[PDB]
Amino acid sequence: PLPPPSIRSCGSQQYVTSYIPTGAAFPPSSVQDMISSMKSYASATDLVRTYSEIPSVEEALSTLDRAAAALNARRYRDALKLYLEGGYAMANVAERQANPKICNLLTSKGFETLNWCARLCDWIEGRIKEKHPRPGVHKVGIPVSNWDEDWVGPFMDEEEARRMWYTPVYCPHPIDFSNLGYRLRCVETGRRPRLMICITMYNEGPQQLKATLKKLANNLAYLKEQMPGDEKSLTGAFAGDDVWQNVLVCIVADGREQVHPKTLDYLEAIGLYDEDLLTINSAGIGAQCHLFEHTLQLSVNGKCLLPIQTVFALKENKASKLDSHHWYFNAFAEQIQPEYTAVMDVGTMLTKSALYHLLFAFERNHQIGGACGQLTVDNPFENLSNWVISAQHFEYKISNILDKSLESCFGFISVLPGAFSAYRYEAIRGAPLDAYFQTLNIELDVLGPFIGNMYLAEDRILSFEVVARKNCNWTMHYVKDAVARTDVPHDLVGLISQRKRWLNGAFFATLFSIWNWGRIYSESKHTFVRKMAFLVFYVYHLLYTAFGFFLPANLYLALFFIVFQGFQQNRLEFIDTSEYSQTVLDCAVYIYNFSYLFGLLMLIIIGLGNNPKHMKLTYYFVGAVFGLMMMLSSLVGAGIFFSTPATVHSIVVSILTVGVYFIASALHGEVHHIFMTFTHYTALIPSFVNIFTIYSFCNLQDLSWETEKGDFKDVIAKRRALEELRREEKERVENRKKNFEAFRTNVLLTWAFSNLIFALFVVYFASSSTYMPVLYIFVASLNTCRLLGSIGHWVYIHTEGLRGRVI
Amino acid sequence: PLPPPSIRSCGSQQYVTSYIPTGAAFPPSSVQDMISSMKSYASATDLVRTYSEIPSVEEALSTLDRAAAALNARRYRDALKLYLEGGYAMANVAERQANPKICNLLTSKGFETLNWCARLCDWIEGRIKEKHPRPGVHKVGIPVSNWDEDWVGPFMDEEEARRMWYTPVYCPHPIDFSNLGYRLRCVETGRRPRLMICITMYNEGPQQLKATLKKLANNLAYLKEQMPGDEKSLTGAFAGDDVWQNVLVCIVADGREQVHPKTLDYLEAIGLYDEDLLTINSAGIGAQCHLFEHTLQLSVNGKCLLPIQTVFALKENKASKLDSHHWYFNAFAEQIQPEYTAVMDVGTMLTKSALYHLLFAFERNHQIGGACGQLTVDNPFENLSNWVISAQHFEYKISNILDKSLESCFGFISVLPGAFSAYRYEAIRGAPLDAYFQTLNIELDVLGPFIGNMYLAEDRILSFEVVARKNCNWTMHYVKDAVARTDVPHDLVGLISQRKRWLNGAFFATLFSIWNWGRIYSESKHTFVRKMAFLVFYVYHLLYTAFGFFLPANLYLALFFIVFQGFQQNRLEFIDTSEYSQTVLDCAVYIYNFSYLFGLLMLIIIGLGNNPKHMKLTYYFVGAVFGLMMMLSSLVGAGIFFSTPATVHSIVVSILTVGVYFIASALHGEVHHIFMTFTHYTALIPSFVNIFTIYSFCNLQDLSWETEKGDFKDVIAKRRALEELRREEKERVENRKKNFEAFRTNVLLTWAFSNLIFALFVVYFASSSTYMPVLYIFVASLNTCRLLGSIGHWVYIHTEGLRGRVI
């Protein structure tokens, strides 16, 4: 027992040294005397009280946010106190404001907060039994700021025409959207739309959204304009004068931080967004996302389009596109219960007939479980001086025609991103969607790296699940007339990144399909003929994948043998090289080999090294070298072919190898595009193969993703527990990244060394006369099969319409 | 003007829809009537009041933390209110506690907080003029928990012996440590230590720290035990019976999160840490770091060591080691103003004579601006079955002897990490330290990538700045007898990482030195003979660096030519290969080339791909292959040399190439180590060169690093400004990373392609009879120069002691 040290200025002075003896426990009387001998504090207290006299909006919002954070932490008394303080603060502040909208919104928010406080107090007392109590749902409808008086439509109720509705949601698991008591305007008003469209958006300019909305309005107008009484005309819910009431459009953004500000300005202009309402009404909830609802009316030039029922959902935090599809499908589809479900991106500009053709196919066939339309490049002929655009145009046309026709003949399509794809909401409701969202429900550690890698491009999983669903026989189909025009990158780097993601997804989806093909026979219920056809397609798929795996080696072998060994060993027919100094003959081969090897080494180093945006010059240089090489090879090959007097074998091989493209293009009426873009596509084949495959394989690493009071010892334990949990989480993340990197490295090494070993063995132990015929036979077989598939698809599409009466 | 909608249950019910008309502004009377018609809130209010009756420690600490955060944000009224609330809460809570220490600490903290509140109120009123007001400094001394009664020392004041002191500091820029009013116990008590030691620590076990402290105590004991009256004995402040008062030890940790808990337990055991004091006294300050001060007494077995004056500084957030050196040097050196300054790491176990030899050299020479001791591996002979440890032991011995002697002859040393290095605090005070910490004061964007890369290993910058300081002639020196024993990794992967950082730092420091060598002649003031000697050393340095840049190609050429082309073209002398099938002769060369190329490709892919921890098996396999190849080459070369009848040229070349190691080792008396470890080191040369250089060059990417009230529009503007600032920061970070990656990729490509092109040209346009003599001449010249340097250093060290009387 000793008096405290005589130090009354601890924070007043600059530096003070003191000694605090522990174990004495002090006398209470001395401490009380020390406390009573201080009078300055009163002044400070008075000042603080004066400062505390007046509240402010910022303080109220901050207190409400802290209350929400406490409520999420399961501490209820502190949440109640903060909620009461915030409610009283807002109620007091609301009178100061001079803007009527702010005054009304603040008054409403204060009343809601006070009612929630009363309900929470009643629950804490034990009067009401609930689990996870939350503030009640309260959607607010307000007049639209700008309204076009000079607009003519079919008919619009004033409540629907001039009021926009808003509500923030908290639902953490989207499957519980309906249980928690949320509702939509369409369901509330009694309308039951039959078709739904999802338009995912992330970091886009207003122009793309404007074009997409205009095109959708044009499609609705065309659907309305069709006359009844015809065989072609649709019957039922898609007739005229009421079509706009059976279609709903959902616009799902990805995150408030990443949204382009001009997009928000445009959305607010058309009456679908308001910052003040979001700021005020979302204070206490801690919403996961906020949804606005309207029936927007658009006017372009002097023509007024049709009204569109629109729901705009904006998520609070950035997530994957699969998360947006999860929200859309589960919440909105399970609530509305539509019949069809269309998926597209932002910027996809449809033609006037896409919806009509899709609905016509779905209604006529009754066996189609899904459909995809044709994809096209916007303005291909304009600016033909650009080679990348022309190459992409040729690739799209040929891929569509040949591959899509061949795959749609058998009734199984591997849709390529990002198409405008429609599924009927009866074949995907159960197991297929469960397998679709498996990544979002299970952490990557349990699944493994192989399962996680394939979901980067996730459409093919849905396609395969629909085709092989248990106790059902669902088949897919391809519609030629559903044309969707997109925009393509103008440079190499964006194309490289896009092809990287496409190739990763395609490769691992193909591996999964080959692994699990047996489920069609083991579980599904198809016809026997369908099973035999699927077996034949399986054999073809295996052969095609195996040939595509060894493509760089085959390209190198073909170029080397034909061109350079013809020059060296005098096999070019239009010139004789028995002369010359025996130095040029070897020099050609040496130059070719050294250039090819150095280019491959540089490309792999750069691709595995850094992002392909600050290495533009090197990629351009390598592409130019490879393009010049390919053009030289093409000219030499054409000369060699023309010089030969020709034979039946030669002409048959030439036809079945090269002319299949032109024959199939002429059969379907699209021949001029091939003529325009064949030369441009020919000069990018080595670039395509080498660069895109190497960059895709190198960057496979791109993985995605309660005590109120207390004493001192509790504080120490809490801090230690938090530190332990943080360290364990960091360790787990490290382990996951290590596993994924190891897997990608093993795959890349296997691929590269397989190609190199095959090339070396074929070069050293084979001749140019015992190898080329095998390659010719293989290529001819593949192209013959593709041509037969295309012809079969054309015959079916032009015959079934007339011959379906019998069957 | 319309009445509010009749909705009194907004959060009470599950789901309610409402319409809020904006622009009406409401009637006040209706809102007042609606408010007055509610009575449930009172119950909630009462409950809240009851819950608010009792305070708690956690609430007080949280409020103080929020007050500190507000004060850092330049808002003063909110900070004052929160500080007052926290002070009153702590004052009320202090009486509840039953633990006397907690009661006393809480009472003191409450009084300090109230005094700071009063001072801040006075400042806000305008009575006091200050800039950046902060709470006053207040260091607290408390008794040590555990005290050893059975301990005998020279003499200790009870205040110093039984009290440990603590204070948290806020100084954001360490240069202002003295201005803000902080102080140290040694300076306060009047002691003026002359020598300082810094012991950096980060994520280490207690055993290393215990061993380091025991070794330092042994060094102090040896320094005390020396007798006076001898020529060898030191004179002055380092005499006997008072040596322990002239040495201070600073232990700087790197971050509370990363510190091993057992290390904290051990530190608390010896009376240098306490969690309760840190938790309580650091609540309001928002300290950058916390420092404890003591004079610790250690006992090992039955012998009691000497007391050590220790200051333990623990930083709040993790930073680089350069940050720890910044804090140490600036704050503590500028305050204490010592004479010398020693730097070491944790785990470096000194011998009994290191300090004596260092101080002896510094006092005798009077021109030495810095010195470094010899580095050794602990227990080399024990567990000789391990090859990595033996290879490292041989490398350390040879590097020390040859390179250090040669460089110390001229008076310029490039110290290798991490040595026990001592600088006198007179040649580094000004410009050298400014150039040392240039990275910490200027962001990497202004400097560029080349400047930023070299500071990864930062000692050589200090060495060069000391050597070339303006208007001064400072030279460095190497002491052979200052032996420091460390611990080395037992596996390949840790060695790989350590060598990666070492090689990056060494390469870029060497480039900087070669770039800026001219400053010695342009600015410094040396003797003419010194300038000529530095010119000669510059020529030698350029030649050595140029030879070392092209090492992999030379190794490949030597192995290939000698061994495999001797086997193929019958040049092995102990066997004739004119027989055989002409298939084996080519097969040997083909196998060698293919294996070498495949190994290099795999190594570069793995090194650039992933972290070298989950690729252990592949690295081990490649190392084993290269080791077997090197052993075969060594045996073949030994046989070839022994078979030859020999000549003057042959014996001279053999001596000057290989036997220089043994001659120099025998000259200095350390010969058995070479005999033991030569075989182990021979089998790791290709592994060293290839693996370490490739991994070092691949991973060069490793870069490091106010309105109180308000209205609504201010809130919106604040949110928009914060979003804009965040996006700009993200863009800047992206740009910096892009630039660094591009630089590293360019350097790697240059190195690899230079080596490959040189190798190809020499293989194709040269013979094994017109190339090997040049290589022999080059290697012989370099080794002759190194041997001459070593002999000169030995002669100087054994002669100057006797011959210094004349000069």
Residue numbers in the entry:
A (entry chain B), B (entry chain A): 38 to 742, 759 to 860
Sentences from the paper on this structure:
The core of the chitin biosynthetic machinery is an integral membrane enzyme named chitin synthase (CHS) (EC 2.4.1.16). Here we report five cryo-electron microscopy structures of a chitin synthase from the devastating soybean root rot pathogenic oomycete Phytophthora sojae (PsChs1). They represent the apo, GlcNAc-bound, nascent chitin oligomer-bound, UDP-bound (post-synthesis) and chitin synthase inhibitor nikkomycin Z-bound states of the enzyme, providing detailed views into the multiple steps of chitin biosynthesis and its competitive inhibition. The structures reveal the chitin synthesis reaction chamber that has the substrate-binding site, the catalytic centre and the entrance to the polymer-translocating channel that allows the product polymer to be discharged.
The apo structure of PsChs1 is the first example of a membrane-integrated processive glycosyltransferase with an apparently continuous but empty transmembrane channel, providing a real off-state of the enzyme before chitin synthesis is initiated. In the apo structure, it adopts a conformation different from those in the UDP-bound and UDP/(GlcNAc)3-bound states, with its carboxyl group pointing to the substrate-binding site, which may facilitate the recognition and correct positioning of the donor substrate at the substrate-binding site. Our PsChs1 structures revealed that the entrance to this channel is blocked by the swinging loop, specifically residue Pro454, in the apo and substrate-bound states, but it is open in the (GlcNAc)3-bound state. Molecular dynamics simulations of the apo and UDP/(GlcNAc)3-bound states of PsChs1 suggested that the VLPGA motif also acts as a permeability barrier that prevents water flux across the membrane in the apo state. PsChs1 was mainly purified as a dimer in solution. The two PsChs1 protomers are related to each other by a twofold rotation around an axis perpendicular to the membrane. Although TM topology algorithms predict IF3 to form a TM helix, our structures revealed that it actually forms a bent helix parallel to the membrane, as suggested previously for Chs3 in yeast. TM5 is an extraordinarily long helix (approximately 80 Å in length) that spans from the TM domain to the cytosolic region and projects into the opposite protomer like a sword. Two NTDs from the two PsChs1 protomers are wrapped by each other to form a symmetric and domain-swapped interface.
